[PDB]
């Protein structure tokens, strides 16, 4: 699946990995993340991510 980079801190949201520690199961598409989801490293909002394609 897709990978999205947090432009603030360089954290890669990997859809394949999800973000379980923050309520996100593997295979969760970035667009399907709750609007309140933020980068688990720097706290940047979704808006600060860019899809790596
Ligand atoms: Fe970040």
Swiss-Prot record:
Any single GO BP term: alkane catabolic process
One Gene Ontology MF term: electron transfer activity
Rubredoxin-like domain mapped to chain residues: 2-52
Chain sites annotated for binding Fe cation: 6, 9, 39, 42
Cofactor note as given: Binds 1 Fe(3+) ion per subunit.
Record keywords, A-Z: Electron transport, Iron, Metal-binding, Transport
Cofactor: Fe(3+)
InterPro entries membership: Rubredoxin (IPR024922), Rubredoxin-like_dom (IPR024934), Rubredoxin_dom (IPR024935), Rubredoxin_ET (IPR050526), Rubredoxin_Fe_BS (IPR018527)
Pfam family, one: Rubredoxin
Top-level taxon in the UniProt lineage: Archaea
Temperature dependency: Extremely thermostable, being unaffected after incubation for 24 hours at 95 degrees Celsius.
CDD domains, alphabetized: rubredoxin (cd00730)
PROSITE patterns the record matches: RUBREDOXIN, RUBREDOXIN_LIKE
Family from the record: Belongs to the rubredoxin family.
Protein task: Rubredoxin is a small nonheme, iron protein lacking acid-labile sulfide. Its single Fe, chelated to 4 Cys, functions as an electron acceptor and may also stabilize the conformation of the molecule.
Record-given protein name: Rubredoxin
UniProt source species: Pyrococcus furiosus (strain ATCC 43587 / DSM 3638 / JCM 8422 / Vc1)
